[PDB]
Design a protein around this ligand. Structure first.
Ligand code: HEM
Ligand code: HEM
Lengths: 158, 158
């Protein structure tokens, strides 16, 4: 239904209120993702060494999560902004998977991430039907390349 | 003179013949960057631990440089494809600088990189005047954010 440009446009528009940067608000845009993630998906804290028992307040006051918040937020901005360019998008997916090899994640989490992230964006404001659908379309492609890459890399996959 | 979109368009067009991917040609697109880099800038090999004395043939036959070739090539595709979005672009610059802290690079190299890279693109084909100018404009902005970020981070800078 939607072409790549429209998906990119919708995903980019949905992030205008969650922009990366160096000011207090930008740091909050990233930190709040982890507060949402740790509150609503506490079973996934296990992957974050030393932070397995962190509460939202622990995350709020953690420089580790200020910095990591910016990294994941940046990653999602990159996905949104390069989606139109399918080969670059797929390159970035593979590189993300490579960089997560160390965490030994259940590979079914690659799709689940997009539920966390859209839920977060409902964790601060309006995410209209089209924008959520765009993220789920992007997520579907992210996951398809992730599982292909995992299989090609002799790693566990779904 | 050029707006951000035109710079992005020119930088993206210049990379169509150097696309990331998983086929032999795509791996070559990345490996060849390091063969060019190591041949023409041998004084910079010092940063690559274990590869300080590598020749082009050593790079050609190195899985390390096949993989690293894809990483730098991907990075330059990301710069080109997100340039229009200034805040995302600057976020990616800062993250690149952060990830290079370990190498203790002379900070004047951030600008120099763009000479290596445009020289490489003259290392396989036509880079017209507009496209080279676009890379130098992008490089100027990359460097400006790099030095600002280094200074803000209490790190050596120019
Ligand atoms: C539910 C799925 C995921 C889990 C459980 C997960 C887990 C992790 C963990 C544990 C870290 C290290 C953070 C720390 O210890 O402070 C990390 C880093 C990171 N993750 Fe994820 N991750 C997931 C999905 C993703 C996705 C989909 C992306 C890209 C859109 C991503 C991008 C990053 C980035 C950019 C970093 C910083 C280190 C790096 O550059 O690789 N993650 N992740
Ligand atoms: C002349 C300037 C630069 C030097 C000397 C340099 C040096 C290095 C070195 C030594 C490594 C580790 C590779 C290995 O040991 O196999 C590396 C990794 C990497 N570099 Fe650079 N670098 C430079 C500029 C850049 C720029 C401008 C970018 C982005 C456009 C970049 C992106 C990357 C990426 C993506 C990696 C892979 C690791 C990571 O994700 O951080 N580099 N670089």
């Amino acid at each position: 239904s939607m072409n790549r440009q429209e998906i990119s446009d919708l995903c980019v528009k949905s992030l205008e209120g969650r922009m990366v940067g160096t000011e207090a608000q930008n740091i909050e845009n990233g930190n709040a993702f982890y507060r949402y993630f740790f509150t609503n998906f506490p079973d996934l804290r296990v992957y974050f060494k030393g932070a397995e028992k962190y509460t939202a307040d622990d995350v709020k006051k953690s420089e580790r999560f200020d910095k990591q918040g910016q990294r994941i937020l940046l990653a999602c901005h990159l996905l949104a902004n390069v989606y139109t360019n399918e080969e670059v998008f797929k390159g970035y997916v593979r590189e993300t998977i490579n960089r997560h090899r160390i965490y030994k994640m259940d590979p079914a989490l690659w799709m689940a991430f997009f539920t966390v992230f859209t839920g977060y964006l409902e964790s601060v404001g309006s995410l209209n039907d089209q924008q959520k659908a765009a993220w789920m379309a992007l997520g579907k492609e992210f996951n398809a390349e992730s599982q292909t890459h995992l299989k090609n890399s002799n790693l566990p996959h779904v």
